[PDB]
């Protein structure tokens, strides 16, 4: 169920500096190209090893779209202040998300084209790639502007065409890499969290992709009660971490068992204190 997205952001700040423009590209949730106007030399750059097969004209080409989007956001950012009657001494955020999802059969499932202002939905192209959905009164002015200029048929073109065309092209070059997984390594820690009681924490470390599942069971029923779970955290080296725990009556620890479910294990890990 491959996919491709481009997360774009332009933020304005008080001062003499023009707003910063940042664009990040993803193929199957993985970052592969990024562009920051704060760089010493603004340019789209490789964020995955496979993209280093692309020639200079590719980089020069995308970089130029980059340069164009910048003005487009700088200008659009200015039109928003007018719409909302805002002032000049603050900071505002305009974000964009656009892309296409493909099935395993390489067939296009859906196109995406939506924008947010100040982190709230502003305007979005509907699933028919023909009609718009405007969130507020401001959004209405943009909707009309785009309906009269016939913008939908042009983003639709990119989404059913260029987006599908190129995404396949990428998957072809980087499927070997993408498919790559990292089996989690697990262990259980003991902590004095009370007298008569205690805490066991099941650790899952260095696994990729992020998707994982941790369970606890006293030979039989999985302990959903009194179990603590943390959001999956990045270790900073590409892989991720996670842990789950449960209060456990002191001296009874070695009777509880932990299970780790991740797509990289020849089979789910099972361990105990």
């Amino acid at each position: 169920p491959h996919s491709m997205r481009y997360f774009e952001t332009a933020v304005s700040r008080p001062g003499l500096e023009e707003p910063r423009y940042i664009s990040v590209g993803y193929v199957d949730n993985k970052e592969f190209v990024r562009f920051d106007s704060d760089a010493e030399n603004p340019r789209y750059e490789p964020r995955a090893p496979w993209m280093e097969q692309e020639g200079p004209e590719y980089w020069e080409r995308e970089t130029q779209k980059a340069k164009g989007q910048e003005q487009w956001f700088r200008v659009s950012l200015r039109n928003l202040l007018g719409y909302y009657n805002q002032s000049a001494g603050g900071s505002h955020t305009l974000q964009q998300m656009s892309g296409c999802d493909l099935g395993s059969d390489w067939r296009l499932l859906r196109g995406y084209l939506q924008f947010a202002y100040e982190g709230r939905d502003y305007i979005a192209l509907n699933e028919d790639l023909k009609t718009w959905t405007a969130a507020d009164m401001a959004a209405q002015i943009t909707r009309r502007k785009w309906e009269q200029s016939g913008a939908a048929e042009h983003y639709k073109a990119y989404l059913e065409g260029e987006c599908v065309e190129w995404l396949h092209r990428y998957l072809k070059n980087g499927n070997a890499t993408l498919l790559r997984t990292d089996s989690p390594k697990a262990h259980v820690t003991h902590h004095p969290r009370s007298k008569g009681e205690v805490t066991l924490r099941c650790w899952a470390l260095g696994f990729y992709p992020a998707d994982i599942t941790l369970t606890w069971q006293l030979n039989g029923e999985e302990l959903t009660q009194d179990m603590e779970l943390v959001e999956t955290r990045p270790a900073g080296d590409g892989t991720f971490q996670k842990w789950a725990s449960v209060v456990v009556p002191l001296g009874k620890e070695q009777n509880y068992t932990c299970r780790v479910y991740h797509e990289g294990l020849p089979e789910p890990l099972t361990l105990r204190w």
Binding site: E62, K65, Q69, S98, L113
Partner: peptide, 9 residues
């Protein structure tokens, strides 16, 4: 390949 916006907001 990145999108290229049309009409501004």
């Amino acid at each position: 390949a990145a999108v290229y916006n049309f009409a501004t907001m």
